[PDB]
Amino acid sequence: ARPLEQAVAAIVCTFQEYAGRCGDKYKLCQAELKELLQKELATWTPTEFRECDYNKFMSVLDTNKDCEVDFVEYVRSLACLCLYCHEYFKDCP
Amino acid sequence: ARPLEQAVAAIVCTFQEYAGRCGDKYKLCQAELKELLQKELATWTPTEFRECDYNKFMSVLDTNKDCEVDFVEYVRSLACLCLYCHEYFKDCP
């Protein structure tokens, strides 16, 4: 019915797929977040200008693989990827 | 298409729909954010022990109707709604 309801339900579903693997079901570690972004958003690539920002963002996740990531931070990461890879934000400050 | 890519692209779609109405295409005011949430996620309701949190969240948007939020802030609001209305987080601290 409503597109946004299914979309948000889907981002929770993906979080559950990775966070539910083992341990604390409400958390991911940075390694898992990196894996999730690489596998679940595999076709998303940086726009002509946010290439640097993107490369860094993804690289940074590797510096502390065990670091905890909660749901809000996971969703924020998705948002950042939109700013880096979605054409709508190409001109966004 | 990958489920998460479709989901995130839809989240951007909705934002663009509301933010593109008039003014700064990269911003919404909290009044419009509340409008978006009540219309796009109309069937989403707080879980058993998050009614108070949810009520405060919704009341805060009214108190700050004219404040603006960018895309990241908008996505953050969606994350918060998951914490309040999605069963997966029912017992999340």
How many CB atoms within 10 Å of residue A25?
Answer: 14
Of A34, A39, A21, nearest in space to A74 by CA: A34
Q: Does A4 touch chain B (CB under 8 A)?
A: yes
Q: Which helix (H) or strand (E) holds A71?
A: helix A71-85
- CB proximity list for B76: less than 8 A, separation 6 or greater: A72, A75, A76, A79
Is A5's CB within 8 Å of B93's CB? no
Helices (H), chain B: 3-19, 30-40, 51-63, 71-85
Buried b (16+ CB within 10 A) or exposed e, B41-57: beebebbeebeeebeeb
DSSP symbol at A68 = E
Q: What separation in angstroms does the CA of A61 have from each of A66, B79, B85?
A: 10, 21, 29
User: What share of residues in chain A are helix, strand, coil (percent, to 5)?
Assistant: 60, 5, 35
- Residue A53 annotated as binding site: no
User: Quick check: B26 contacting A, CB < 8 Å?
Assistant: yes
Residue B55 counted as an annotated binding residue = no
Q: How far is CA A81 from CA A53, A55, A59, in A?
A: 10, 11, 13
Tokens 């948007």 -> residue: B61
Number of other CB atoms surrounding residue A19 within 10 Å = 24
Nearest to A14 among B4, B10, B75 (CB): B4
Residue B92: CB atoms within 10 Å: 17
State which approach was used to obtain the coordinates: X-ray
A12 and B88 in contact by Cβ < 8 A? yes
- Has A5 been labeled as part of a binding site? no
Minimal Cβ distance to A75: which of B41, B79, B89:
B79
Contact A3, A44 (CB under 8 A): no
Which CATH code fits B1-93? 1.10.238.10
